[PDB]
Structure formats: structure tokens, C-alpha cells
Amino acid sequence: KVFGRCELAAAMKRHGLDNYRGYSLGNWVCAAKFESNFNTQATNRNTDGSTDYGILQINSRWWCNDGRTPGSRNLCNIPCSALLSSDITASVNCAKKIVSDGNGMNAWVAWRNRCKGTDVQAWIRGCRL
Ligand SMILES: O=N[O-]
Ligand SMILES: O=N[O-]
Description:
The chain has helices spanning 5-14, 25-36, 89-99, 109-114; strands spanning 43-45, 51-53, 58-59. It is mainly alpha-helical. The PDB classes it as hydrolase.
């Protein structure tokens, strides 16, 4: 599923991401835009053989099991395919664990490079939240 901007913002708010660990809703929408273009089916292979999955491009090296990343961890206790569903519950819950890990949103390369220090509130402007 490819989410609309305000549609994703609303789902993220409903799932409790707005100000989670002090990151405003705009930060999460910005990250999702640049990680996956709001597409829940997005997948990208990393150089080390792991893969990033879903709207927030959650990585199989640490967070999920894709049956092809030998020696990796499954810290969110899910198959990586659960991250590709039209329902973002699994992605959101795993993202909450990731952002709590110690590095905050710097865990997301796209966020650090394209969202951090910018006017992220512009990503939720015009939405009925
Ligand atoms: O969800 N339409 O911006
Ligand atoms: O992601 N474990 O193959």
C-alpha cells in the first residue's frame, strides 16, 4: 500500500508515534517519505547481505527474520514480511523499539541526512490531525 501524506500522519498519530521519545509527528512522516516513499511494500538490499523492509525500512540484521540473513538478530520478534503489510502496526511497534535503542532517530540514515534540523512540521501541514 502507498499511503497519502496526511493518511500516514493520521495512522502514525493513532499508533502513538507523535512525540514518541520526543520526536514530533513530522519527523516520522519525513523519515517515511525518504526511506520508502510512503510504500509499505518497499524493500532494499544492504551491502552486508541484510535487507530493509517496509515504510520505515527496518533492517533484518537486527530487527526481523527474513530467513536469509545468517547470524543476524530478530529483536522485534517478527518475520520481515510482517513489515510489508498494509497495516503498519508491526512497523510502528518495531520502530518504537529501534528509536529507544540509544541513538534515537539517527538509526535512520535518511532522517539524519534529509530531515534532521529541517522544518519537519511542514510534513503535517494541511492535514486534519
Ligand atoms: O493522504 N493524502 O495526503
Ligand atoms: O534474518 N535472519 O535470516
